[PDB]
Amino acid sequence: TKADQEKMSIALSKLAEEDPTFKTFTDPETGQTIIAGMGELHLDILVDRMRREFKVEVNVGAPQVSFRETFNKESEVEGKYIKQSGGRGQYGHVKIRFEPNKDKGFEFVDKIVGGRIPREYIKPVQAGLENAMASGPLAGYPMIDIKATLFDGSFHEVDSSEMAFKIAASLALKEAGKVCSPVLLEPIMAIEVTVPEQYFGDTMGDISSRRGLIEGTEQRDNVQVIKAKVPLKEMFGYATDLRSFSQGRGNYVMQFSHYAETPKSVVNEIIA
Amino acid sequence: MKVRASVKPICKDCKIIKRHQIVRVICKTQKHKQRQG
Amino acid sequence: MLQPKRTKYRKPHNVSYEGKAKGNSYVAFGEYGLVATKGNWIDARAIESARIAISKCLGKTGKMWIRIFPHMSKTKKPLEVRMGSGKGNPEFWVAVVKQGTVMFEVANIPESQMIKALTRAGHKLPVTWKILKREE
C-alpha cells in the first residue's frame, strides 16, 4: 500500500542511520523501490530488521529496469482530427513523414511550400510528435531514434486550432508506429572481470549460457581480463553466481553501455 | 544404464555382454551404457 | 501436399497393394536407391517427413528423386454412424507401393552420406527398407 510505502520509508530512515551504503531508488517509470544489498545473508538480515526490529511488513519482489522503444523502416501517413468536446466545433489536419533515425532523437524537417501550414503551426505540431511517441503498442515505452518530416496540412477557419493539429499529428504518429512494426531495446551494461586463473572457463560458460557479447581474451600483467556487453537483466543472481563459484573472491565493475535490440525471446518473455 | 530398442554405438565405448544370458550394453562412462536396448 | 490437378472420379476402389513392381520397377536416374520389401501405402505426412529429413541431412548439395508421385486418395466413412449410407468422405492423398518396389534414388555427396540420408529417410516409414546401389 502507499501507507506501506510510507512505513517502509520510515524503516529506511531507521536502517540508514546504521549503514547507508545501501542505495534506494524510486523509479519514475518502473515504480518499484530498488534497495541494494551485499548478498543473500545481507538481504536476509535487512528483512529480519524490517519485520522484527522495525515491525514493518513489506512484500519482496524483483528488480525493475525495463526498456526503451523504437520502430522499423519509414512510412508516411496523415492525421485528420475533426472533433469537439465542450461547446463548439473543432478540426485539424496534418501530413507528416515517420522515418527512423538510428543515431539521432526527435528531428523535424518542414515541407510546407504552398502555404498548406502557416509557420504558427510549425512548432506545436512538433510537440504533438514529441508527446505521441511516449506510448508503444507492444509494452508502452517511448519511441526514440525517429526523424520526423512534416509534409502537408490544412488550416481551416475558426474550427481549426493548434491543439487540434497536435492531436492529428499524434494520431498520425501512432498509426504509423502501428504500421511500421515497432521494436524494443534492452539496457546493456559493460562488465569487466579480472581473474588470475580460476574462473576463466566458469565465466566463459556463464556468459555463453546466460547472455552477453564477448570476443576472446585480454591478457593483463598476470591476470585474465574479459569485458562483456551484457543485458542488465543478466546481472540478476550473477552477483552470487560468480561469487559462489569464486567462494567470495570475485569482483567486477558495472558500467552502463547502451540500449541494444531485443531478440524474439525477450519479446515473448516480458509481454503479458 | 538406458533402455531402448535400437542399440547403435554413440560413444567410442559401447560394447555389449550377454552376461548371465542377459544382454547389457556397457561404456567407459556410466551414462552411455544401456540395457535391453 | 503433393496432389493431382483434376479428379474425374474422387472415389476409386478401396485399395489393394498386392503384386510385384509394375512401373518404376528399378533405379534408373541416381547412384544409390531405396527399395521396399513389402507393399504398403505412403500418405502425405510420412512422405513429407521423409523428404524434410532428407533435405536436412543433405547438406548444401545432393540430388534426390522419387520414382512416384502421390496420386491415390482415401475416404473416411463418418464416425458413430450405422451401416450403409453410401461411401466415405474424401480425405488425404496417398501413394501405393507394391512388394519389391524401388521408390527413391540419390546422388551428389556419395555413398557415405548417401547411406546416412537413406537411413534417415527410411527411419520415418513402417516399411522394412532395403538400401541398394544403382549399377552402371
Binding site: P196, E197, Q219, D221, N222, V223, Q224 | - | -
Partner: protein, 128 residues
C-alpha cells in the same frame, strides 16, 4: 608443454609463463634485451616445464605459415583456398625458404619451398 607466440615488444604479458616457476622480471628483462635489436613484433617463443625453472626459455625467428602476407603486401589471412589474394615473386619466396631452411626438417632450399607452398595452400595464394 604448450607453444606460445606473442609480441616481442615485452615479455611481461603472459601469466601462464610467469606461473611456470620463473620470475616475471627475469624473463621480461632477458627477452626484452635479447630482442632489443628488433622488438615490437610477433615472435614465437618456446619454454619447457622444469622443476627448478630458473630460466629455460628461448625464442624463434618470425613464424612463416601466414607470413607470406608480408611478402604478398596484404592482410586478412583467407580462411578458404577458393580465390587468390595476390602475387609473390618466386625469388623472395625461395630466399625466405633458405632463411628458414636451417630451422626445420627441410635439408635443401627446395624442401623449405615445398613447405612454404604447403602452408600457402590454405591462404589461396601459392608460390608464383
Amino acid at each position: 608443454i604448450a607453444k606460445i607466440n606473442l609480441l616481442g615488444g615485452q615479455a611481461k604479458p603472459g601469466p601462464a609463463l610467469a606461473s611456470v616457476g620463473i620470475n616475471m622480471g627475469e624473463f621480461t628483462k632477458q627477452f626484452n634485451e635479447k630482442t632489443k635489436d628488433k622488438q615490437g613484433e610477433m615472435i614465437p617463443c618456446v619454454i619447457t616445464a622444469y622443476n627448478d625453472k630458473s630460466f629455460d626459455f628461448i625464442l624463434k625467428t618470425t613464424p612463416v605459415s601466414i607470413l607470406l602476407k608480408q611478402a604478398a603486401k596484404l592482410e586478412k589471412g583467407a580462411k578458404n583456398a577458393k580465390t587468390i589474394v595476390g602475387k609473390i615473386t618466386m625469388a623472395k619466396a625461395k630466399e625466405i625458404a633458405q632463411y628458414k631452411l636451417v630451422d626445420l626438417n627441410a635439408n635443401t632450399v627446395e624442401a623449405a619451398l615445398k613447405m612454404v607452398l604447403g602452408t600457402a595452400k590454405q591462404m589461396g595464394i601459392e608460390v608464383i
